[PDB]
Amino acid sequence: ELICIVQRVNESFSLHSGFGGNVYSMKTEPMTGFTNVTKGASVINQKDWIGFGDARTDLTNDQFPASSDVPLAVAKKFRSLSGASLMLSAFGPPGKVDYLYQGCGKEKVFYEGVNWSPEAGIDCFGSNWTQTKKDFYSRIYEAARSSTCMTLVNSLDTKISSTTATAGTASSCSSSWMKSPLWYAESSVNPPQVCGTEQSATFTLPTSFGIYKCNKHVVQLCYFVYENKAKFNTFGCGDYYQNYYDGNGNLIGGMDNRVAAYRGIANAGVKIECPSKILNPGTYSIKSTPRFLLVPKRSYCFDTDGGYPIQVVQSEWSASRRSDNATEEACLQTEGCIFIKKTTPYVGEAADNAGDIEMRQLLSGLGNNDTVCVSQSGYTKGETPFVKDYLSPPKYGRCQLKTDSGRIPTLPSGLIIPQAGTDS
Amino acid sequence: ELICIVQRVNESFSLHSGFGGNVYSMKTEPMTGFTNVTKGASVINQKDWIGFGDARTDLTNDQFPASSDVPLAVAKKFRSLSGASLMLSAFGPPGKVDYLYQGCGKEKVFYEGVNWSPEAGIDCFGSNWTQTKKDFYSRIYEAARSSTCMTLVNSLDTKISSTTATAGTASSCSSSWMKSPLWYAESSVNPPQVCGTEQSATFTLPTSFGIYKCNKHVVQLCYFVYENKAKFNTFGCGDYYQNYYDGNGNLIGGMDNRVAAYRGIANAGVKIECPSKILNPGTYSIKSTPRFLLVPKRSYCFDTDGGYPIQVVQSEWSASRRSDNATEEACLQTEGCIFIKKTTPYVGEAADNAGDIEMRQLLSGLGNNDTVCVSQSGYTKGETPFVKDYLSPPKYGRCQLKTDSGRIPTLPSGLIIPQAGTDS
Amino acid sequence: ELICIVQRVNESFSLHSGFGGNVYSMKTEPMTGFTNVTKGASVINQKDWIGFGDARTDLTNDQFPASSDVPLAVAKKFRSLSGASLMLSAFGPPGKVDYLYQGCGKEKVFYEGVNWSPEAGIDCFGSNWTQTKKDFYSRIYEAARSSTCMTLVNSLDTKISSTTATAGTASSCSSSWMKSPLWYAESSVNPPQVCGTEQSATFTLPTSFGIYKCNKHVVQLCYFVYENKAKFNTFGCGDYYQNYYDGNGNLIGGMDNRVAAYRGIANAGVKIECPSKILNPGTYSIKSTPRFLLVPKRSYCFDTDGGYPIQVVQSEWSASRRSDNATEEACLQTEGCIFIKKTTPYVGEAADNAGDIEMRQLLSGLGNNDTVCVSQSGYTKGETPFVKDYLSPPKYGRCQLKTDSGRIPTLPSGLIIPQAGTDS
Amino acid sequence: FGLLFVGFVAGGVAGGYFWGRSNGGGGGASVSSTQAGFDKIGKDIQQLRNDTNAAIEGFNGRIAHDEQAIKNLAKEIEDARAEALVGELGIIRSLIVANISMNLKESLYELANQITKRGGGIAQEAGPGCWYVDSENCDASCKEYIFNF
Amino acid sequence: FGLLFVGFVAGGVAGGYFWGRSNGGGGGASVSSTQAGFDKIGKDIQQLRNDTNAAIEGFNGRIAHDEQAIKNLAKEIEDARAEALVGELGIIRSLIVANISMNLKESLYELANQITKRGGGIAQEAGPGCWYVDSENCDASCKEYIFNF
Amino acid sequence: FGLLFVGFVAGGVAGGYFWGRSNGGGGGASVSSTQAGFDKIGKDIQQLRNDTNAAIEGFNGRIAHDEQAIKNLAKEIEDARAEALVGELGIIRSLIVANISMNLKESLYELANQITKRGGGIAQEAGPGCWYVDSENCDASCKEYIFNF
Ligand SMILES: *[C@@H]1O[C@H](CO)[C@@H](O[C@@H]2O[C@H](CO)[C@@H](O[C@@H]3O[C@H](CO[C@H]4O[C@H](CO[C@H]5O[C@H](CO)[C@@H](O)[C@H](O)[C@@H]5O)[C@@H](O)[C@H](O[C@H]5O[C@H](CO)[C@@H](O)[C@H](O)[C@@H]5O)[C@@H]4O)[C@@H](O)[C@H](O)[C@@H]3O)[C@H](O)[C@H]2NC(C)=O)[C@H](O)[C@H]1NC(C)=O
Ligand SMILES: *[C@@H]1O[C@H](CO)[C@@H](O[C@@H]2O[C@H](CO)[C@@H](O[C@@H]3O[C@H](CO[C@H]4O[C@H](CO[C@H]5O[C@H](CO)[C@@H](O)[C@H](O)[C@@H]5O)[C@@H](O)[C@H](O[C@H]5O[C@H](CO)[C@@H](O)[C@H](O)[C@@H]5O)[C@@H]4O)[C@@H](O)[C@H](O)[C@@H]3O)[C@H](O)[C@H]2NC(C)=O)[C@H](O)[C@H]1NC(C)=O
Ligand SMILES: *[C@@H]1O[C@H](CO)[C@@H](O[C@@H]2O[C@H](CO)[C@@H](O)[C@H](O)[C@H]2NC(C)=O)[C@H](O)[C@H]1NC(C)=O
Ligand SMILES: *[C@@H]1O[C@H](CO)[C@@H](O[C@@H]2O[C@H](CO)[C@@H](O)[C@H](O)[C@H]2NC(C)=O)[C@H](O)[C@H]1NC(C)=O
Ligand SMILES: *[C@@H]1O[C@H](CO)[C@@H](O[C@@H]2O[C@H](CO)[C@@H](O)[C@H](O)[C@H]2NC(C)=O)[C@H](O)[C@H]1NC(C)=O
Ligand SMILES: *[C@@H]1O[C@H](CO)[C@@H](O[C@@H]2O[C@H](CO)[C@@H](O)[C@H](O)[C@H]2NC(C)=O)[C@H](O)[C@H]1NC(C)=O
Ligand SMILES: *[C@@H]1O[C@H](CO)[C@@H](O[C@@H]2O[C@H](CO)[C@@H](O)[C@H](O)[C@H]2NC(C)=O)[C@H](O)[C@H]1NC(C)=O
Ligand SMILES: *[C@@H]1O[C@H](CO)[C@@H](O[C@@H]2O[C@H](CO)[C@@H](O)[C@H](O)[C@H]2NC(C)=O)[C@H](O)[C@H]1NC(C)=O
Ligand SMILES: *[C@@H]1O[C@H](CO)[C@@H](O)[C@H](O)[C@H]1NC(C)=O
């Protein structure tokens, strides 16, 4: 009598092939799946990152932690002061807090800027400080992206040729002036009959500032903007001009109305424009019309040892105040900049403008010890190599790839029968 | 009695190893092979490409389809007009067809240029229009390579300072002048005793033109070329100069013989040179010698949303006419430009110069729905990952790799005997 | 009676898993390991490399092979002459050997420079020849990195406008002058009452030199450096200036003290600075103060057909002489430059400064036929894909990767028992 | 027909492992049961499935590091990277299915071997999972011992 | 010597699968035939070869997307990419050869099992592809039934 | 329990391949030896280990070409490349271990088959590496012939 174990499959069984053996089963289970993506900011390396901020990351604030968008451990990694902003330290407007931002970290978090917004009502003849702001932060992010460190340089070595020019002051600037640029005027110039002498100056970008190496400086090459020659000629003779030169005489910045059209807004009167440029260390020269001279007095110093794409955090007031989105737009037009943005208005716990629940959720990742990827779509853990949707660039770290769920292969489960040979 | 199936192999059998089992066989067959490569132009995505051409892709031509190098379906994807060329629309010479080339497509096919060749005999004081042509198309291809779209900008906002200068006209230019650049002359300048005033102008490159975003403009910064100071001084006082400035006074183009040597060909008389430059949107200024001023009036507007390497198609006349190979040389010296070239002369079906059999073979791929790779060597389908010879760059898509045929592994066939264990 | 082969394992046996079968064994052996790394210079392709040197690679030296740091076969691949250096041929100082360095090779070895060091005591009003040296070699390496070939261009076509200027000579320069730049002075200029006329010149960088194609030229755009306007005014009227222009009037080099500060060292007297620039072929113009004009007379011609990262070999004297480390620092700040450096002083076999044992060990790889990777850490053979420590960039070829030894998987050995099924 | 073969059955009829049996009368008609007490197979399957976690964890633990400064998604490159990873995942899958197959088969062989060594040598193997028993030496209580059904 | 072994033969002599046979007289001399009616093996081989198309199509369908703006061929990078693909193709090959080997072997086992269950149990297996028949119970027409030669 | 199974033993006790044996008295107690003359296994192992060199050489021979002009090490990219190569090396390892396992197992089967065909058919297989001998037909000098111990 022939007695056998007999193997059989149903219509419910399907055949799964293998290299060296097949398997019949009724059920399949996917081999792997997608990794969740969390919105907001985070870091892949908790020992190499730096934050720059204001009251919302300032552990010394009188209202801490209610005034803070990050817990204590994260705040310690920030260089922050209530009322501060990078831009405010760039120019040093009268009566504003003047923090010396400095730090090192391959990953960088920028969460400031709001303390100079249209709400602050700084005038000082600014053509458009929101324009200046956007330009300034575009340069910071551009230089920060390729640097390990950053520091304010709160005083450049400068030198004026004029022995009669004097420091400029304006009612529209609290009856004083910026820290940077310095404003020198020649009160003896009067288009009577008297034209004065061309003004000249040097400023030096150093190769280092304290412990920080400088390969790159972000500075403002300011100039005055006049409506036209006729309106400028109520102040000086000839055409307006302020030109910036390197050590050899190469023009690197300024405004020269001897060759360039006037573009001052009609009847607005004189304005100042302050475009930021990335310059190498060295000594730089200035030539200007006799009556008005502007001279850069500060910079931000960067190295070129490299860094990761940076993270920039939306810095706006609560609804009651007048904000701008300059840092947003700066981040958007700058390579290697990741922007973190709230979906609901800013509502503070301490006061109106400090300690927002949504922001604390978004910044909570700063935060974690198990983030492996940071991207414009958010951050991930190292669960699988896959995400359901793309991780938008900029991005860095162990970053998951998008694949359709259907393309993820399956394994057999729930009652399994092996198959090999042709069985026929 | 021991009865057995016995397995044996000949000297004709060879041993093929496996991970978990070997195989004896007498024959092998290669696992895969090379994919054919077809010369000419094609696209990998039929829903995202654009063509720019002339009569040879103009479905509205009276002789269509005999005048056409592409069938009807392909012609519909082209923006074309009989007699047109990109260069002809750049300058708008008198009595030439002036087509407004505009379109969008990640893949781009340029098949025009021949309608401005030496045959056309355009003069208008051109130093060397073939040089201008090569320079012009180098700029177009350079900007097109990184743009999704392209459009003619058929009129820049311009403004002259001179209240006495008048529009320039030349017998050598059909007793009129280009559309671009505009030519303003001061008839009162006479080196008698009268020198005139320095001429000035602005032109504006817009941030958009109709529905098309502009991040980049290709424009011509023209100037006059004189043999020497003495010969220029029969027209104006001082040295010749025409300089182009951005809004701040940075020199971005022109010819200044106050610092630069004269290089006009001896006894040739005055000439015009028109080098093309890629410029950002904005307002630009001009300063020139009192007597002659040139002002850009058109541009080609591009975005920077990105594109694929472009395809440029040889645009020459039949043998009876005088051609050039400027677009060929422009393509060759420009990154991301793929050039398609005939091996036999152009012989048209309609007339001499429209409807060529070899070109219709070369363009037929424009064409197909199953092209996965486009390269300077031709295009391929997605049959295998391998080609016999290299696919020359530029190239894009699912592009095959070169491997020797010997390095393609084989599988056993024709009577097969398995082997495992050491059998000893 | 049931008789069986019985399989059993000890506590000494460990279980190794496989795809389709496991194995018990007591011993493991690693599957692969690291490839050794040899310090010094080498090449991955003996048929495509070129050397440039001095006596230490000069097979024609009277003391060869004792004066040589490479054997005969390697010396034949060098273009070398005793007493020569790239820099010495750039300027051609009086009484120095003037070798025409020229050659082709994708891999490039630079082993010269020492024959112009502070020891040589060349003066000729050099502000700082060590600075000039570093700048010069930075430009050479930068251009060499992307070129297949290199050649001295020992005479540029030049032309001066002044009919009265005469060739300049200096006691501090052996009572003659450099080959490049040429020095023209106007002896009639005297700030009495006489100021002279602005001096002018052209020099042409050719598109080719002999068989060598030129896409790029390394040239020196020299100028004089004065302490201040007052000290310059004992020589000429106005401010000092020497400006270099391209064919259109774009400033590409020079020193203009009409806009740029004077930076001459106090009481040092007049100095010459000679920064090197990479320029395209073409004709270039010069404008200078009436009394002094400098005109480039040589260049180094390069193509842009591409090359590998270059190798630069420390070129210093023995301890008795005064060396510099300019080529070291040039190499360090230039992408694609690999620097080879001795750890012990230079001690020659022939004389003090030629034929050093450590250098012969370091250069011996030039040398081998089985080098697959060259890097800043040294060179390797193609033994395994792994090295114990990183291969520092720059690097090229089949280059090994760093992995911890623990991550290299193992295979079973010494008495092996197979296992499959669950055995339970 | 005995562990070297797998068979098909229509509409109803349970799939899996069964006892099937021979002739007798000359000629007989055969017969298949309705499933064993093969709980060794149930446990073996559970163990084999869980052991796949090693290869899956190896795959999940491997995520290439990347750095993109660019602001707009490079979809085609992105999709190519994914396609390559899925390719690798596809071959690992094929190895895992075969590894299950071959080890389950072995576990079935080890089941049959246990049966052979209880009716020893009343068993007499006829290829894996098959036996010839003399319905004479050994009977009804005997086969019930040897085969458990 | 019976499906666990493969043997060598000189100059002429056909390769493949044959019937070989034992003792008898004490001591005998053996004997190998000149090939069976194993058309099951011919069909099984054809089927197994065709089933390799799945793995080959998987490989052919996978072509990385690329974009080069550069004008001159980067041969070394180009050759490296090809070498890597050929490497991957080489291991797939090794998997395919083994997959054929192991499934052909199984198909040969399934052939031998059919033979065992026709002389049942006159067969008596002696390892796969081998049997002991009593040249007494079963004879000349009998072996011809059981083994078809 | 006979080539389909591997067993555990405490402190001392040699590991490897042994002769083990049955009943007799009813009921007996069994017995395992202290190792064979299986020098075929020693030689087979040596051969199989050496044959792994083919797959290892294939791996060692494959080094991607690269070109970096950059002056500072890109550690993260560097480590990622290594991790990927080690990943590939890890699966090759898994294939090699299985290839050894399956070929050693086969070599053990070929050892057992030789034994079956010396006591033929006094042997009577009971799954691979196991036999039923009639301690009657064949005795003491007989088993010593068939099994060499
Ligand atoms: C004083 O200076 C102020 C600053 O210069 C100036 O305010 C500027 O005014 C202009 C004109 O009114 C405004 O332009 C508005 O810009 C928006 C935003 O543009 C940017 O973002 C869009 C994409 O937006 C979409 O996605 C975002 C999320 O990412 C959504 O929030 C949004 O709703 C959209 O759905 C992007 O397309 C733009 O890209 C352009 O520019 C970049 C380079 O910078 C190019 O790469 C790109 O190709 C394109 O050209 C851009 O990045 C835009 O959609 C509008 O059309 C419009 O241009 C500025 O926003 C505004 N800026 C600030 C900081 O306030 C003041 O007007 C001036 N005051 C006076 C009186 O002169
Ligand atoms: C006439 O001209 C001469 C040449 O210009 C000038 O001599 C120069 O003098 C300056 C100031 O005294 C010296 O600077 C010294 O530079 C060293 C070396 O800097 C370079 O290397 C370091 C790394 O060094 C470490 O590693 C190397 C091995 O690779 C070791 O040997 C060494 O001991 C260290 O452990 C590097 O960090 C530097 O990087 C800087 O510069 C580069 C760009 O060039 C940047 O990428 C980088 O971010 C950073 O800014 C550099 O590459 C440095 O360590 C010292 O701090 C110092 O700066 C010059 O060496 C010296 N050069 C020469 C050629 O002689 C004369 O002074 C002048 N004469 C007069 C009277 O004016
Ligand atoms: C290994 O070989 C087997 C046998 O050729 C392949 O099994 C075939 O798989 C397909 C499904 O992919 C079935 O439709 C066929 O019926 C199978 N053939 C047989 C004889 O069973 C198996 O696909 C191969 N393994 C791999 C991974 O390719
Ligand atoms: C798997 O193991 C077997 C056995 O070690 C290898 O078979 C050897 O293959 C070479 C040809 O590559 C033959 O010359 C040897 O005779 C074979 N040895 C034996 C015992 O047959 C096989 O190469 C291994 N598989 C792979 C893909 O490496
Ligand atoms: C193939 O399948 C076998 C059986 O599931 C796996 O063997 C297991 O391996 C681990 C060690 O990795 C042991 O702890 C388990 O005891 C093994 N299980 C059995 C039943 O032996 C094997 O790992 C799989 N192969 C691979 C490469 O994953
Ligand atoms: C084919 O066979 C399987 C089992 O051999 C049947 O699956 C069982 O069905 C019931 C209800 O559908 C489940 O609760 C059991 O859990 C299943 N069995 C198992 C594996 O536990 C299946 O229905 C059969 N198909 C048909 C329609 O004949
Ligand atoms: C080894 O064996 C094979 C077949 O076992 C022989 O191949 C046959 O030869 C003839 C003519 O060469 C072919 O027409 C047949 O098709 C082949 N057989 C098969 C597989 O169909 C081979 O010639 C033998 N080699 C030698 C020289 O002995
Ligand atoms: C487990 O078994 C192995 C052998 O079965 C023992 O290894 C032997 O030990 C001695 C000394 O340690 C060596 O010189 C031999 O070469 C080993 N045998 C072999 C494989 O040649 C091992 O000691 C045993 N472990 C224990 C502690 O029982
Ligand atoms: C063992 O492996 C090596 C490959 O390294 C091979 O050359 C040698 O012939 C092999 N020895 C034997 C006897 O198989």
Numbering used by the authors:
A (entry chain A), B (entry chain A), C (entry chain A): 3 to 193, 197 to 429
D (entry chain B), E (entry chain B), F (entry chain B): 9 to 157
Article, verbatim:
We also solved the crystal structure of D/OK HEF, both in its native state (resolution of 2.4 Å) and in complex with its receptor analogue (resolution of 3.1 Å), and the structure of the enzymatically inactive HEF (resolution of 2.4 Å) alone and in complex with two receptor analogs respectively (both resolutions of 2.2 Å).
To avoid the enzymatic cleavage of the receptor substrates, we generated the catalytic mutant for the binding experiments and for the structures of the relevant complexes. Thus, we designed the enzymatically inactive HEF protein (HEF-mut) containing S57A, D356A and H359A substitutions, and expressed it using the same method as wild type protein. In order to study the molecular basis of IDV HEF and its receptor / substrate binding mode we solved the native X-ray crystallography structures of wild type and mutant HEFs both at a resolution of 2.4 Å. Both IDV and ICV HEF displayed obvious esterase activities while HEF-mut proteins exhibited no enzymatic activities. Due to the presence of cacodylate buffer in the crystallization conditions, S57 in our IDV HEF structure is covalently modified by the addition of a dimethylarsenic group.
